[model samples]
Target: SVGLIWAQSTSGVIGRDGGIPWRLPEDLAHFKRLTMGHTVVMGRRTWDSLPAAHRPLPGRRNVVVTRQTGLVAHGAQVVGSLEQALCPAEPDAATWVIGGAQIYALALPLANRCEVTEVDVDLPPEDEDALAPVLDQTWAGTSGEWLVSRSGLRYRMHSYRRL
Candidate 1:
């Protein structure tokens, strides 16, 4: 199966100040539980922004897409495009398109499902340089009930499947 997973601010901004502005351990736990053992594809920038201790994301195969022919991602596979990263996916296993805007834009159309978390805080409009791609009509989404994070932020998970 193919999946696109991400978290976004209320304004749909997935990034701010070159990184995620909020810290939600609950969402991080959900991300780990859902993606464990699966193949993850993301842009090079996403790989760079990952927590230093978990750069390669233990137990998962990390595929980073970048145009830089000379760059090497220490513990992850570096590929030139989305197709190269996706080409090796196992038929019976899940391949998740983890992101940083541009990569999600390329994967959104072909992804079969979406695991999105709507973060309650809205970033300043001027600082929202990176926003989530609009998951079009082909995806039917249903959000779970809201919950407050340990850090006092409100959030909810939304699942979207291709129809």
Candidate 2:
């Protein structure tokens, strides 16, 4: 099955200057638990955003979608498009589209489920003077019907299955 996994702040902020705006270890653990044994697909930017030590997430097949040629993502399968990063492209296991905003926009329509960590904090507004501009958009097509909610130490993980 194809799924999507991500965390979002209350203000719909999911990213800030290429990384997550918040540091919630509980949420991070939750993400690992859900996608650990699955095939994970993400955009080039997201792959770059990962710490160098954690480039290819361990215990999972990493598929990176990038347009750049001759780029090496250690331990990841590089592909030209999301279509090339699916089941047959990565592995025939449970697949999850991990993200950057553009990847989420493309993958959401094809996903059957969404595992989201809804963080309660709202970021400060991004103004011309703000050093870090907040993200104003959330992942679209992620909200289905609110199938389930699991409480974590710092956020609520919501799971939704598309009919």
Candidate 3:
């Protein structure tokens, strides 16, 4: 099965003050619906940011890729290496590559479906290190259909199958 990665952030800003920067509740709901029952792989920071109640997203195998040993989740699995974290998932399993910068960088190369919620907002000129900007340059791959699009709250999920 192909690796599925989904994200919703504008101008590389995912969380501001440790919370989602944008207020696209519908987009978030869509994300959850699409990625449910999937094995989600993320870095430590992303995993940590999860609210305590939703620590290990239920009905799925949660995998966290980190260098830290013994990284524990309430109901998640931890793997030290990317390969192990993303081992061949069950044929029926939908594995999603979630992120917090570093993990996205590592998985982008291998992921097959990149479901990016590209918001129609530009980054502050002063803000640097925007993730998608880096992705545009690093991901020498093609994109799939424009699944969804709207207004200032415009969010289009793009899929990029690896070359």
Candidate 4:
């Protein structure tokens, strides 16, 4: 079982021009805290999006799912597929699915928990590839929701238990 988490903006935008728009240091810190000691999975592009210094979010095993050869991130181990990543599961460890579009799409079907932080803001233009797609349909409905930080960013922290 794995937990998926992402921070979305008021307009449902997760990334603007390949970068996150909300500047919530607390949220990120909370993310790190929640994922600590867990395995994190990402696609090649998500790994590329990270700054060199932050390639691998520390204290967790960074596994990158990719089909590209020679596609490697400084601190992440490359995986050919999701099965390979989960196959040799660590007996007592939890794996967290980190994202970008492709990776999230693949993991959505198998995730046991979808931890989404929904920010309250107006929707953006209909044609921007900035906002990431919502996962409510994939998991049915979230089991938990909550708010984080007081930066006018009310978060609906959704946790969807796999059926």
Candidate with the greatest lDDT versus the true structure: 1
* TM-scores of all candidate predictions against the true structure: 0.94, 0.80, 0.75, 0.82
Model 2 steric clash total:
0
Which residue segments of model 1 deviate by more than 4 Å? 89-92
Please write out the lDDT profile of model 3 over residues 1-163, one tens digit for every residue.
4464545455566544554565665566766887788778877777888877668877667888878887676687888877778774454457787776677767767765666666655545234332542455434444444444443465666655544
TM-score quality measure for candidate 2: 0.80
- Candidate 4: how large is its RMSD? 2.7
lDDT of 4 by residue, 3-30 (tens): 7778777566776566676677666776
Off by over 4 Å in 2: 87-90, 125-154
Global Cα lDDT for candidate 4:
0.72
Candidate 1 lDDT by residue in tens digits, 126-157: 64477898877788989899999989999999
Each prediction's Cα lDDT score?
Answer: 0.89, 0.73, 0.64, 0.72
Q: Which ten residues in a row have the lowest lDDT in candidate 3?
A: 125-134
Q: How many angstroms is residue 121 displaced in model 3 relative to the true structure, after the best TM-score fit? A: 3.6
Q: How far is 26's C-alpha from truth in model 3 (Å)?
A: 1.8
Superposition-based RMSD of candidate 3 using all C-alpha atoms, in angstroms: 3.8
